[PDB]
Amino acid sequence: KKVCYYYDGDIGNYYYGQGHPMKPHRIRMTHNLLLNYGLYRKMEIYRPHKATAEEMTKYHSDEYIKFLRSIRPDNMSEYSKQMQRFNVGEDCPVFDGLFEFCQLSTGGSVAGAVKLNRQQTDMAVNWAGGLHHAKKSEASGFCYVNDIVLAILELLKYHQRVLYIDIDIHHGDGVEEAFYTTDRVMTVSFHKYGEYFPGTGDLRDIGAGKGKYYAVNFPMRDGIDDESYGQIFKPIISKVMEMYQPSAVVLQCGADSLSGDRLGCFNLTVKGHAKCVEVVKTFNLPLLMLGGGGYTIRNVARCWTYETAVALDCEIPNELPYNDYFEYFGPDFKLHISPSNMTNQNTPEYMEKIKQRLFENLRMLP
Amino acid sequence: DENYFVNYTFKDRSHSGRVAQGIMKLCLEEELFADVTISVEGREFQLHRLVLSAQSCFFRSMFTSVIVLQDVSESVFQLLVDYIYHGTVKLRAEELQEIYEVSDMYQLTSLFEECSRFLARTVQVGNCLQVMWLADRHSDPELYTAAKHCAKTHLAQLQNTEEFLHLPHRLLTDIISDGVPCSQNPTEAIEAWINAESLRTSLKEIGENVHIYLIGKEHSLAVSLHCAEDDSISVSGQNSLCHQITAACKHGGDLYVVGGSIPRRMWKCNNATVDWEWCAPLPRDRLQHTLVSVPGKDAIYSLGGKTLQDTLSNAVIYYRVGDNVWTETTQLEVAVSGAAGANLNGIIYLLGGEENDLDFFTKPSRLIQCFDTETDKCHVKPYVLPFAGRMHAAVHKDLVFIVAEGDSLVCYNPLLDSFTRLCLPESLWKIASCNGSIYVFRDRYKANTYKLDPATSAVTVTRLLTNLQFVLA
Amino acid sequence: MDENYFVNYTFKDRSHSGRVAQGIMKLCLEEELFADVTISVEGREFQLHRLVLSAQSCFFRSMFTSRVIVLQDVSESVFQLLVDYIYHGTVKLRAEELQEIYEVSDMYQLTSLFEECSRFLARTVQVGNCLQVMWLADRHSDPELYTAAKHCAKTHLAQEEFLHLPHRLLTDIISDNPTEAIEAWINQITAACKHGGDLYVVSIPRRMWKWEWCAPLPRDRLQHTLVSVPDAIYSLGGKTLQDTLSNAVIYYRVGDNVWTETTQLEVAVSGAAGANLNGIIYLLGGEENDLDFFTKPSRLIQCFDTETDKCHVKPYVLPFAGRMHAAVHKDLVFIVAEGDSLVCYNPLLDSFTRLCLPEASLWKIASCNGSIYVFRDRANTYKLDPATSAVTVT
């Protein structure tokens, strides 16, 4: 089907500070891989418009947005009592042109959601957004603005019920918090639980009140491999959309889930990770693929080109083209990665118990 | 025991104690039923055939087949018999050699192993050759290795010991079999040893490696020390990671630090180059987790530590050096953070920290819990430490030295379940064990380092980072 | 201390007691040596040892210190098993030679056996032989057995030995149709518990009714246990309102209607069975935590000390895990669950005992003064005699 790609050229020039894990340069890597891979021609490439703060504040509190608009590396000594209540400063560091990047990230995500909103296209691959951790009141994670919330909020104007599948290692607590109460959004995250960063996802926690039986979280242990992931992923989404029947899916492809990650304990293959996309593609609904958490920039690039190829339904070879970033990839220089062996503490009885419990957590869904 | 109301077997768990405490109270307090008289150096002792035969397998062979012995001395015999009757004896350094030989000759293994371990713990370069020869004669494996190891570490100084010259070829070859680093110049002493093929055909040079790493000054710098010459330390490395280290462990001759922004990564300095390597990042978001290096498993363990939610974590995860993978293991009995961690021949001890109080608080902790590496199981010691809180434990030989807040310094021995108070000269201190000595470092200096030996409890001052956040053994 | 491990310290061999105990075991009976004494009982001769006999018995010490010696009133069998007990430490008790062993082990100074036979003679007391046991506990210095004989003499006083009973014993028997007998003389709900005839029962897990009203629970819990310690009703374990296993314990003083908080169990369990044994609380299995997100049937034993306020897990595991229901008959707890496999647990000794049950539903075991009553969840009232292991329908 028709595919829409959103990427601003000057999005890899937003250095997060020395030593920080999240590097937006990975967004350029994918877009530099796509051109040399013979995929740019087949896909409708757009340019994301800087989202206005008045449009950005459709979910976030106005004071938070103004605080983001004013914070600068220099004008910071005075801005000292605001960083200690907005969680900015230490884990979510300030950098030159922070708000400009905060508008580029939300830009393509809302433009894409507008394009599927108008029933004009089918897939919108925004590899620049996907920041799923910025809470309503204040920043969290590595994010500052939760572009995902604006994307869903745009879809909700016309579409009645909307899905959001997240396959990032983390829980994506921001989105869940934004749609705990409401029944119009069905969030399903496949995170890792137990002394991990979000710490909120648990089998016992569901959307409160009107969101009862919706926020389906699947806790996991470290080292879950492709075969287990495939065996678990399909029979849950095929039941969620069989009792929810969402009009549109917002699927986020975190690149932490891959093996060899800097901040991830999973063990995955690009085929295994980018099989969630060939799964959802067979349901033939408007689909919005976002980027997101990825910290092995080399594997993030390798991963994100492949689902882009899957969305086009194209077939692509392992030999990497001689791009600008060719020297970065491994000595084999191939696309697909092999999983370094690590024990899978997701024992079959463990996953089967969770799968069953989730199954009655959706059989009660109206 | 078919039916409790009709017929069953009745077992007394207190019977063994009833007999053991009914033996002291009679055979010693009020001498009765003394069938046999045994005299040592003309000092008769009224002894029972039954007790001595029931404990010793050597006296029984004599009773079944007024006895007078020759090798044993009266004083050593008195406490030996008071051990057979009581079970508790006061071991003394001066006369332990005789206890070793006599107890082995009497097949009293318990008081033979405990002096095969007393000897193995107080062995020094002055008497290393003599004890190694004695262990060879008495066929003791653990003491033999613990004496050859000391000889091989200090082989350079032993070149003029007058016993190295007068040694059988088998012992010299076994000494030069392994270790013996090039700093000791094995070839020079081996040449004078003849004054000759096996000695030169098998002399593996280990090569001296840096054994002490200080982390401090906060551009935090990691300096390296190597005790050389006599009772002196030197410097051989000023590596600076330029990051924020929050935990560290020394495995082998390598310094596995952890830290940086989002302190979940890893590094490693071989000390042979300023080029840091990259290891698998820690798969957990935990801080104040102790790092224990187990060389007998080629692993590094992370135990305890706080979560990001201010809840204590009782999770243990190890890291294979070869496979470069972090794997989960059995959880601890109770959750701790900041607890000193020491590995003693496979058993990892977690000493103190901040245990979870009943009222959602972190009280200073005094527990001693040990997790066995081989059985992979963890259990709590019934007794507790005298001081609770932050402390820096360093294994030395078979016992653990623990310096907490204050100036007191205990000497915990795990097998005996007993402590030994030692007073440091008059600030939270830090200790380690280079070579065969103990070094104690002041937290902030602006004397800095004191070298002490537990024998005589003497603290000699020995002689630049303002801050010393981490010191590794 | 003042003991340098590198200079001078004392070594305590924790294996000395066992070493000598087994040395006696091996070198005394298996092979006879160093006998130095000979004791004759009813013709039979035992080649004993002076030291062991005088070690744990002061009758053979006060009687040895102050060749063949003959005893006066002991059977050749009973004395032989006594010798085994003084030598091995594990004897096989039998109900036929019980009355004799009590006296012979009392006139000898073997206290542990004296208490053992006292417990045996107190858990097997029958109303027919109650008065004789009372006389036995009167001649010998046994208060506990005396009270146990008093109970069966009092709770069955309506029904030879009583005809000629002295007034001295009768006064104690009557202290705790009495006049007619004495005429002859010598001429929904989550948890609940029964506290001396008060059927306390636990809307929300906070209400208590006796109907009547009582103080509410300081915690909302489900599948929490409840005991009847005579001096408060204790609540342990349970499942929280957030579907997480509970770990807290609270008293309930009958006098002052307040629930005090106390020490927490070492292992948080749910649906466990509770049994009070003379001031020590026993929790029986339950639904332990599994996979950090669910539960599993459990076989664990929790000993909680009420007087000292401590908790501890014994290493032994129950024969059958899962939900269980237990009762206290006498000096021990009888445990049953679905499966018709009754077990008996005697906390003092380290041993269970299995027993067959009719095939016939989750069973519900009780413990009356008379005997045991095992009910069925669907199958009528039963009464089984543990001595014979035979069940009789009501």
Ligand SMILES: Cn1nnc(-c2ccc3c(c2)[nH]c2nc(Cc4ccccc4)nc(N[C@H]4CC[C@H](N)CC4)c23)n1
């Ligand atoms: C999507 N995503 N990718 N990566 C992360 C992420 C984000 C943050 C952290 C993190 C990972 N690992 C971390 N480890 C530590 C070390 C530690 C552990 C336990 C207890 C105390 C400290 N502290 C972190 N932050 C603090 C929070 C409080 C603030 N005052 C200072 C910075 C973080 N999220």
Ligand SMILES: [Zn+2]
């Ligand atoms: Zn992520």
